[PDB]
Amino acid sequence: SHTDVKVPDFYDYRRLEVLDSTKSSRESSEAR
Amino acid sequence: QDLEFTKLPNGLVIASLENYAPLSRIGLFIKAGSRYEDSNNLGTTHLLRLASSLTTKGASSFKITRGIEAVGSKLSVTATRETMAYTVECLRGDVDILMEFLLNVTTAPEFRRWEVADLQPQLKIDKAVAFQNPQTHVIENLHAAAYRNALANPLYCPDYRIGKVTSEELHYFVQNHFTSARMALIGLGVSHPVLKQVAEQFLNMRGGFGLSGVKAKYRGGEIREQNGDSLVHAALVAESAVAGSAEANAFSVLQHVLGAGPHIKRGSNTTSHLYQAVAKATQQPFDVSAFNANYSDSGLFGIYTISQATAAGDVIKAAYNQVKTIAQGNLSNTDVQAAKNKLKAGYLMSVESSERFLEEVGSQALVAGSYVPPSTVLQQIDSVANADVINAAKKFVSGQKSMVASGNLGHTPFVDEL
Amino acid sequence: TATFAQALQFVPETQVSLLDNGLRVASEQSSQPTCTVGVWIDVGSRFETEKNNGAGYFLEHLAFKGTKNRPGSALEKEVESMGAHLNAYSTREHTAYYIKALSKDLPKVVELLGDIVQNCSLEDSQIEKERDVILREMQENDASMRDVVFDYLHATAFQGTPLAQTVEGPSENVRKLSRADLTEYLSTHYKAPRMVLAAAGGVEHQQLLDLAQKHLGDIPWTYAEDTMPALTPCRFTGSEIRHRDDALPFAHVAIAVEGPGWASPDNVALQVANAIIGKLCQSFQTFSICYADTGLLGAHFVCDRMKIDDMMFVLQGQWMRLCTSATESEVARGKNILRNALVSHLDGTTPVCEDIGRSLLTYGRRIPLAEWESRIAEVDASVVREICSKYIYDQCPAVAGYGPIEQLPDYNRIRSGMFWLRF
Amino acid sequence: MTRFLGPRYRQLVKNWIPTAYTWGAVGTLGLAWAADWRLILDWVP
Amino acid sequence: MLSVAARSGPFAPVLSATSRGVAGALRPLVQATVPATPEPPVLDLKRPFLSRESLSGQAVRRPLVASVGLNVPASVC
Amino acid sequence: SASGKWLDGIRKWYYNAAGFNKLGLLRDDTMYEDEDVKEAIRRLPDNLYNDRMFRIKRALDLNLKHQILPKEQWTKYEEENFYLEPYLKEVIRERKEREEWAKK
Ligand SMILES: CCCCCCCCCCCCCCCCCC(=O)OC[C@H](COP(=O)([O-])OCC(O)COP(=O)([O-])OC[C@@H](COC(=O)CCCCCCCCCCCCCCCCC)OC(=O)CCCCCCCCCCCCCCCCC)OC(=O)CCCCCCCCCCCCCCCCC
Ligand SMILES: CCCCCCCCCCCCCCCCCC(=O)OC[C@H](COP(=O)([O-])OCC[N+](C)(C)C)OC(=O)CCCCCCCCCCCCCCCCC
């Protein structure tokens, strides 16, 4: 059925502004 | 703190119980339903239960809808073949205006041509969602097969009648069946004086009794519906006993000896005679159980099966034979005691919640002069013997059968060859 | 005569106690001949790694299949001879086993309940039978479309984090999980200070506590080697998953933003907002799904394929309306709807027992209806405006769609709908 | 009209006042900047 | 045990019918989306037979035969 | 008092001056179909609806032919039927109720 679902990894494209994780999520959002 | 039955000069019954609950519930119960229709006005009651927010002499449709929403409350309608019920739920202090709404919905409806004619196409939709679960249409056919006239009439509107139920029919039905001597008002979360203030508004409504109807006559029918489905559903019954009878208690205990339904999640139902019988006749998925209905002037008892299409004949037979062994008196004290345990416990669990408790009280109020507490019910259960159970099984085995089946019937048997 | 709020004072208290191993016992006594009793456990799919994703569901399949003291169907026969019922469930975050019974049977009930959680007989034959059953149950399309879209939503929103993974897990895993994995799972997660024993109905608290010491007091409490698995911290991603199949009758759609979690106060106000929102299409709902540190806040609907765009427009417009223009009159209605829901849910012993257990796991304490009423009374249109703006306005959503979804708007078009140019 | 006298309309107008005077500021400053309107621009440091 | 629900157990939801009126505060189970049945072919109206002279000969005396042709209307005996 | 006969006199004068009776038309036929009027027309029973439609077509045909009915067939002031007024009053009440809800 569906349960085998998994999004493939997007590591190459994501911003470093969330990978450098020492700041709450929503504040990051605001910076971006 | 206890219930208090009472009857007004109109013949209206009223009862109440001040449980200190934050949510008050009030039910108006009526002797009406599909059994009082005839072939010339079928489907009237279905549209009647859907029409429970059209305009009235006392309040506009817009007013009823928005006013009930604005406090968070609900107004439900529930029917059977024999009774209808209008129920209101509200927070403490909301009663009065909602009671005005209840009064106008039941005693002074308008059935304006255009609103009725805009409401018609919803019958189709409601019946469709009902008929997604296959059990419903099988049971509907079972009543048609089992009876010639009254309990035969369908709960959902016939297809040929959709779009052709008229305002005049609604008016006539309400005028001839919504009468004060057919009624009870029940209140949970409400002090008797307050419920008296409510019932006071009903003093000038339609009095006396109405049209009494006809007695149901038994048919030894058979209905077959052919589809392409790989699973076939079947029901096989006979006539058993009237509601509120000792013999009906016998039949109940028999149902619970044979097997009434599961108790463990993903279990094997080792206690269930029918399930264990069938499990040795088929190796693909099946379901089986026993069936009870009871009415005012009749009742039905039988078996209900679901199986693969090629296995049906083996399943239906394997089930039936099991009952026969009880008729011959292969029955054990241990089974009987376990069955009575299941029955007493299931009964007490069925009335934990106020919603079902209200229903049960309202059902009693329409047919008896005094409320029967559960202890008395438990004793009546305790009082069934083994001989009563065996006699009930013999009644089933001997009497004339009715049958319904739906699916791919290339291997289903005919009622004459069981 | 009383007021609603005054009737909320008559509801009885919930008593709570501790054993020496740190298991907590909680009860609410309601003077009835019937009762519900269960064990709630602070374990779920978000503690499993990709190596054993799906273990708890497996364990749930063979929980009631036998213990050492009661081999095979003996347990089932003893439950059925009392006239009692036995049930279980498993979630992204919790697990539960409970029993419904007569109040007379409490000593046996607890006994059985302790026999089940400490002494299941994980026999190879039964393991293989459950393996075949679960594989068969996964082979055919035995899932409802609603479940499909909600699983897709969790997968896209919480990708790269344990919450993305499903309770059942992949089929590749059930054909490959072993008894060693099951016993390791139990040894590592089923520890006393993570468990609650809850009861509602005609149950006395001290009797329950005595029985708890007798039948549950030997459950260990020493977490060993910190054997508990290390796992990834929480993150929410604005993203979409689209599964197109133009043969299905109707399109299913789900869209959320990130909610605050169990602990925050804001939840109350949000619920009010929900009640205000909830024609075009057949079916529609709003929802809040809470976790420990995060959540999903959004809506779900079904449409004919030619009416997806309009419906999305209507929904996002209502969101913007609440963020910018709410008024007192509607807010009052929403508060009343919320009051009615809260009091309607807690009817009968089962829901109450369940509430006790879930509450002691999530909140650390039972929150009485009076406190909820006091929290509801403080909301007003200004609070709704503020908090809706705080979680909805100009945010990136997570979207999932299944069906004939050609007309589902592009992601940029959906993102631009989360803000107004005239504000 | 006579319809739009009542509580909801008062609340609704109060909801939009701030946005209104902000757009007013935008329009005024833009007009001045566009027409080099010295009457306003001579006061800008 | 005089209500359908207290008596019938798991068959109560098919032995009873309900409509919950104007929308409530909680959200119900089994929501049931509606793929309704398609419409049949549309046809001309039927004439009545309100005389014996018009009904005379309508009753069946022999079983039927089904017919079709490549340049003739389809027909039934 | 006499004032009733006097007002009814001027009203009859105005009615004959208007002249839709020369075309065989009732007063309620001559309303402009705004939203409320269309909803009131939706509510009519079949007989009234069909009578209205034919009357209107007949007036249009006469106007096409720059002609009028014989005097014998003109609509008379003392035996006219305001068949649409009741339905219109209900439609307007409903709209007023909704408006009044909308300001709270
Ligand atoms: C030339 C070369 C050609 C070849 C080039 C080749 C290359 C080309 C490639 C590119 C092609 C691009 C194609 C077009 C793409 C369009 C995309 C699109 O429409 O997306 C839909 C987009 C998608 O959303 P949706 O899914 O449809 O959802 C709809 C919702 O309602 C969404 O709701 P919402 O609230 O988010 O948004 C709604 C609101 C959002 O907008 C706003 O609320 C404001 C936006 C920013 C401020 C703009 C204010 C402009 C006011 C008028 C000018 C005066 C300025 C001040 C000076 C005063 C002078 C007296 O917008 C509107 O309601 C529309 C009108 C907004 C302006 C209001 C004034 C209307 C009258 C205009 C004429 C005035 C003439 C007289 C002026 C006075 C006398 C001189 O939504 C929109 O509605 C977009 C609105 C776009 C508006 C554009 C306005 C341009 C005209 C300005 C005025 C021009 C006259 C100036 C005269 C001189 C005085 C200054
Ligand atoms: C009549 C003559 C005099 C008229 C003078 C006019 C005065 C007012 C001038 C205002 C200029 C700035 C307006 C900005 C509005 C932005 C709105 C918007 O949607 O922005 C976000 C959008 C979309 O951004 P986004 O999608 O990336 O994100 C926006 C989301 N928020 C808002 C939450 C951040 O950005 C745009 O694409 C806007 C492009 C605007 C281009 C304007 C060009 C200048 C034209 C006017 C100046 C020239 C006048 C010449 C007069 C000559 C007289 C002799």
Please name the residues in contact with B263: beta carbons below 8 A apart, sequence gap of 6 or more. Answer: B269, B271, C79, C80, C84, C85, C86
- How many CB pairs below 8 Å do chains D and F form together? 13
Closest ligand 2 atom number to CA of residue C421:
19
Please name the residues in contact with B130: beta carbons below 8 A apart, sequence gap of 6 or more. Answer: B136, B156, E17
Strand partners, C253: C301, C401
The Cα–Cα gap between C358 and C7 comes to 24
The Cα–Cα gap between B52 and B4 comes to 29
Mapped onto helix, strand or coil, the DSSP state of residue D16 is helix
Phi, psi of B14 (to 5 degrees): -135, 140
* Alpha-carbon dihedral angle through residues F75, F77, F81, F84, given to the nearest 10 degrees: 100
DSSP H helix total and E strand total for chain C: 16, 11
The Cα–Cα gap between B60 and B160 comes to 31
Closest CA to B158 of B78, B51, B54, B38: B38
The nearest alpha carbon in chain F to B117 belongs to F43
Resolution in A: 2.7
Residue B246 CB neighbour total at 10 angstroms: 12
Closest CA to B365 of B2, B3, B5: B5
Expressed in angstroms and rounded, the spacing between residue C419 Cα and the centre of ligand 2 is 17
Q: In what order do the strands lie in the sheet with B287-294?
A: B222-226, B402-407, B231-239, B299-308, B287-294
Question: Which of C:122-151 have CB within 8 Å of A?
Answer: 138, 140-143, 147-148, 151
Given CB atoms, is F99 within the 8 Å cutoff of chain D? yes
* Alpha-carbon dihedral angle through residues C18, C19, C21, C27, given to the nearest 10 degrees: -60
Contact B232, B308 (CB under 8 A): yes
Contacts 24+ apart (CB under 8 A), C378-383: C379/C268, C379/C269, C379/C272, C379/C331, C379/C335, C380/C328, C380/C331, C381/C326, C381/C327, C381/C328, C381/C331, C381/D11, C383/C269
Contact B233, B287 (CB under 8 A): no
Strand partners, C26: C16, C198
Q: DSSP assignment, residue A7?
A: P
**Which residues of chain B approach chain F closer than 8 Å at the C-beta?**
60, 62-63, 66, 113-114
Contact B122, B70 (CB under 8 A): no
Structure tokens at A16: 């470093």
Question: Which of C:357-376 have CB within 8 Å of B?
Answer: 369
Contact C202, C34 (CB under 8 A): yes
Chain C positions in Cβ-Cβ contact with residue E34 (cut-off 8 Å):
282
Closest CA to C47 of C202, C177, C229, C291: C229
Chains B and A touch (3+ CB pairs under 8 A): no
When scoring E20, E33, E34, E37 by the number of chain C Cβ atoms within 10 A, the one with the most, hence best to mutate, is E33
Mapped onto helix, strand or coil, the DSSP state of residue B230 is coil
Amino acid at C279: K
Residue C412 CB neighbour total at 10 angstroms: 8
Q: How far apart are the first and last CA of chain D?
A: 48
Are the beta carbons of D3 and F103 separated by less than 8 Å? yes
Q: What distance lies between CA B335 and its chain's CA centroid?
A: 28
Q: Which of E25, E27, E33 sits opposite C250 (nearest CB)?
A: E33
- How many CB pairs below 8 Å do chains B and F form together? 12
Rounded to a whole number of angstroms, the distance from the CA of C161 to the nearest CA of chain B is 31
Cα C288–Cα C289–Cα C294 angle in degrees, nearest 5: 110
Q: Produce one character per residue of C342-362: b if its CB has 16 or more CB atoms within 10 Å, e if not.
A: bbbeebbbbbbbbbbbbbbbb
Is C60 one of the catalytic residues?
yes
Cα C46–Cα C48–Cα C53 angle in degrees, nearest 5: 110
Question: Which of A:6-25 have CB within 8 Å of C?
Answer: 6-7, 9-10, 18, 21, 25
| Residue D24 near ligand 1, beta carbon < 6 Å | no
Marked catalytic residue, from C48, C60, C240, C373 = C60
| Residue C412 near ligand 1, beta carbon < 6 Å | no
Dmax over CA atoms of chain E, in Å, equals 69
Contact F59, B23 (CB under 8 A): no
Structure tokens at C293: 């540190």
Structure tokens at C334: 């929403």
Closest CA to C298 of C203, C419, C157: C157
| Residue C421 near ligand 1, beta carbon < 6 Å | yes
* Alpha-carbon dihedral angle through residues C256, C318, B63, C339, given to the nearest 10 degrees: 40
Phi, psi of D40 (to 5 degrees): -100, -40
Strand partners, C19: none
Q: Which of C159, C168, C233 sits opposite A7 (nearest CB)?
A: C159
Expressed in angstroms and rounded, the spacing between residue C395 Cα and the centre of ligand 1 is 23
Determine which residue's CA is closest to atom 8 belonging to ligand 2: D30
Structure tokens at F92: 């307007």
Contact B122, B77 (CB under 8 A): no
Expressed in angstroms and rounded, the spacing between residue B303 Cα and the centre of ligand 2 is 76
Phi, psi of C301 (to 5 degrees): -155, 165
The Cα–Cα gap between B38 and D38 comes to 90
Residue C310 CB neighbour total at 10 angstroms: 13
Closest CA to C174 of C210, C219, C214, C139: C139
Please name the residues in contact with C354: beta carbons below 8 A apart, sequence gap of 6 or more. Answer: C38, C96, C98, C198
Strand partners, B14: B6, B185
Closest ligand 2 atom number to CA of residue C394:
33
Strand partners, B77: B86, E19
| Closest ligand to the CA of C394 | 2
Q: Which chains form contacts with chain B, at 3 or more CB pairs under 8 Å?
A: C, E, F
Amino acid at C66: G
The Cα–Cα gap between C232 and C162 comes to 7
How buried is residue C206: exposed, middle or buried, by Cβ count under 10 Å (0-12/13-18/19+)? exposed
Residues touching ligand 2 (Cβ under 6 Å) are: C 394, 419, 421; D 30-31, 34
Identify the residue whose tokens are 């809800």.
F101
Closest CA to B276 of B231, B242, B319, B212: B319
Mapped onto helix, strand or coil, the DSSP state of residue C94 is coil
Contact B205, B79 (CB under 8 A): no
Please name the residues in contact with E13: beta carbons below 8 A apart, sequence gap of 6 or more. Answer: none
Provide the H-helix boundaries in B202-352.
246-258, 273-279, 312-327, 333-349
Identify the residue whose tokens are 């999530």.
C362
When scoring B1, B23, B356 by the number of chain C Cβ atoms within 10 A, the one with the most, hence best to mutate, is B23
Given CB atoms, is B263 within the 8 Å cutoff of chain E? no
Phi, psi of C189 (to 5 degrees): -115, -20
Closest CA to C250 of C145, C150, C151: C145
Contact E7, B287 (CB under 8 A): no
Q: Where are the beta strands (DSSP E) in C120-279?
A: 195-201, 240-244, 251-259
Provide the H-helix boundaries in B43-185.
44-50, 61-70, 95-107, 113-119, 122-130, 134-146, 167-177
The Cα–Cα gap between B405 and B407 comes to 7
Structure-solving method: cryo-EM
